[PDB]
Amino acid sequence: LSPAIRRLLAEHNLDASAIKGTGVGGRLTREDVEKHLAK
């Protein structure tokens, strides 16, 4: 549904293979990618 995170993800230019999606099952979630940045 309008994945705006695809923007932030490509914005800061990181590798999804460097974070641990805590969505249980490896389901990435916006709550973590932000906990990292969010500053």
mmCIF file of C-alpha atoms in Angstrom:
data_model
loop_
_atom_site.group_PDB
_atom_site.id
_atom_site.type_symbol
_atom_site.label_atom_id
_atom_site.label_comp_id
_atom_site.label_asym_id
_atom_site.label_seq_id
_atom_site.Cartn_x
_atom_site.Cartn_y
_atom_site.Cartn_z
ATOM 1 C CA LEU A 1 0.000 0.000 0.000
ATOM 2 C CA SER A 2 2.189 2.894 -1.232
ATOM 3 C CA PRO A 3 5.458 1.590 0.309
ATOM 4 C CA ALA A 4 6.965 5.006 1.183
ATOM 5 C CA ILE A 5 9.744 3.142 3.026
ATOM 6 C CA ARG A 6 11.108 2.028 -0.365
ATOM 7 C CA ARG A 7 11.998 5.716 -0.685
ATOM 8 C CA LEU A 8 13.694 6.142 2.744
ATOM 9 C CA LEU A 9 15.442 2.762 2.197
ATOM 10 C CA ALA A 10 16.918 3.849 -1.163
ATOM 11 C CA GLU A 11 17.261 7.401 0.201
ATOM 12 C CA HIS A 12 19.925 6.672 2.867
ATOM 13 C CA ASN A 13 21.210 3.854 0.551
ATOM 14 C CA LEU A 14 21.557 0.866 3.003
ATOM 15 C CA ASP A 15 21.342 -2.943 2.466
ATOM 16 C CA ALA A 16 18.226 -4.671 3.899
ATOM 17 C CA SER A 17 20.690 -7.541 4.597
ATOM 18 C CA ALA A 18 22.193 -5.542 7.531
ATOM 19 C CA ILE A 19 19.118 -5.114 9.778
ATOM 20 C CA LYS A 20 17.089 -7.751 11.734
ATOM 21 C CA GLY A 21 13.387 -7.489 10.821
ATOM 22 C CA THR A 22 11.755 -8.165 14.162
ATOM 23 C CA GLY A 23 8.404 -8.778 12.382
ATOM 24 C CA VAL A 24 8.866 -12.477 13.423
ATOM 25 C CA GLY A 25 9.671 -14.626 10.252
ATOM 26 C CA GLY A 26 12.009 -11.854 9.034
ATOM 27 C CA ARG A 27 9.058 -9.665 7.966
ATOM 28 C CA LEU A 28 10.820 -6.273 7.778
ATOM 29 C CA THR A 29 8.903 -3.426 9.511
ATOM 30 C CA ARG A 30 9.185 0.400 9.465
ATOM 31 C CA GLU A 31 9.473 0.440 13.296
ATOM 32 C CA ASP A 32 13.127 -0.818 13.187
ATOM 33 C CA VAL A 33 14.660 0.955 10.116
ATOM 34 C CA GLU A 34 13.473 4.131 11.927
ATOM 35 C CA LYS A 35 14.732 3.147 15.469
ATOM 36 C CA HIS A 36 18.153 3.131 13.764
ATOM 37 C CA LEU A 37 17.785 6.558 12.128
ATOM 38 C CA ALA A 38 15.013 8.579 13.961
ATOM 39 C CA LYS A 39 17.808 11.089 14.700
#
